[PDB]
């Protein structure tokens, strides 16, 4: 109909259609020397021409410990089969995907795998609290 000037939106949801949570805990288990991954599939709700969506995070995320900042344990975050760096990662729609809805922006059905990492490979774990946050940033590109 009558514009309706602007045409670009982004909303990231679980593929359930449900929301992501504020906080997330990985179950702490040895599992023959491994750490389980908080997989979650995703939706990305966007109008057509969505596809040029970029994803970079605010800072390299940390298990954060005030009293002891001594040792930090790495965190690796995968989206669309790609790691997520503080460096902007150009994405295409990554929905797989393409459908049309003049009433709706059609989803982008795949998984974010936050897979926390160790400083050296094949590593025996330290003991502590490890608190923290992960900022995640969605935008468009120039």
């Amino acid at each position: 109909m009558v514009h309706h000037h602007h045409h670009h939106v982004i909303d990231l949801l679980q593929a359930d259609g449900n929301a992501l949570p504020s906080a997330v805990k990985l179950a702490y288990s040895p599992a023959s020397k491994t750490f389980e991954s908080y997989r979650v599939m995703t939706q990305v709700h966007t109008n057509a021409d969505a596809k040029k969506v970029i994803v970079k995070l605010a800072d390299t995320p940390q298990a954060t410990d005030v009293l002891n900042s001594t040792v930090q344990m790495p965190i690796s975050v995968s989206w669309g089969g790609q790691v997520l760096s503080t460096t902007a990662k150009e994405f295409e729609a990554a929905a797989l995907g393409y459908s049309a809805s003049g009433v709706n922006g059609v989803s982008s059905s795949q998984e974010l795998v936050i897979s926390a990492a160790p400083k050296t490979a094949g590593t025996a774990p330290t003991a502590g609290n490890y608190s923290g946050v992960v900022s995640l940033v969605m935008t468009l590109g120039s």
Binding site: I10, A19, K25, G132, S135, L136
Partner: protein, 211 residues
């Protein structure tokens, strides 16, 4: 936890526009908003940096909103000055935790909106050029970015279907140049830009310069 609309905006002639913020949460949220300016955009030399709220080209009112559960708010964006040429910004929307009503590593999703501060008279002018290594170079001489969809490296002067349609889909911002990654001996080139509603389509061709 929230969503914003829209996530890209153009600002012309000193007029404000609104970004709306919608809560998906049952708990009251606190939202702060901040602007970064984008330098050398469209290039490999593109980086972001924090600017102040009234002297950096963008006026953002407000920059802090209490967002009740399921509520919605409007944030006003307007240009401080009307630039001589196109500047581009990013406006970030972030849940701040005074409180928002192993361990916990809370996930803070952030949305940033791409904002185009536009000049009074949008003028598009493109230059042709040859690199060291004689790749073909496009330069933006206009006061506005040039959205390039497809480039036609025609063998002849005219657009036969033998010419090489190379898709670039790239924005070339003013005062900047762009590498076609083509050094070959094409005679003339044709460039295709983007349109949907209103802003007036044009087509343009520029002669190659020899190697």
């Amino acid at each position: 936890n929230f969503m914003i609309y829209p996530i890209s905006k153009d600002l012309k002639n000193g007029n404000s526009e609104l970004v709306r913020v919608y809560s998906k949460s049952k708990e009251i949220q606190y939202i702060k908003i901040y602007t970064k300016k984008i330098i050398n955009p469209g290039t490999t030399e593109e980086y972001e940096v924090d600017i102040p709220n009234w002297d950096g080209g963008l006026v953002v009112t407000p920059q802090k909103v209490i967002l009740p559960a399921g509520a919605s708010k409007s944030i006003r964006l307007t240009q401080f000055k009307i630039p001589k040429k196109e500047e581009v910004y990013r406006v970030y929307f972030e849940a701040v935790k005074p409180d928002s009503k192993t361990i916990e590593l809370s996930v803070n999703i952030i949305y940033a909106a791409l904002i185009r501060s536009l000049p009074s008279e949008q003028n598009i002018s493109l230059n042709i050029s040859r690199n060291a290594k004689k790749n073909i170079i496009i330069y933006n001489n206009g006061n506005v970015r040039a959205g390039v969809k497809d480039i036609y490296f025609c063998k002849s002067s005219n657009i036969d279907d033998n010419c090489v349609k190379k898709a670039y889909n790239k924005n070339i911002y003013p005062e900047k140049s762009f590498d076609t990654l083509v050094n070959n001996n094409f005679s003339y080139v044709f460039i295709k830009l983007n349109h949907e509603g209103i802003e007036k389509e044009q087509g343009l061709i520029q002669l190659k310069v020899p190697a």
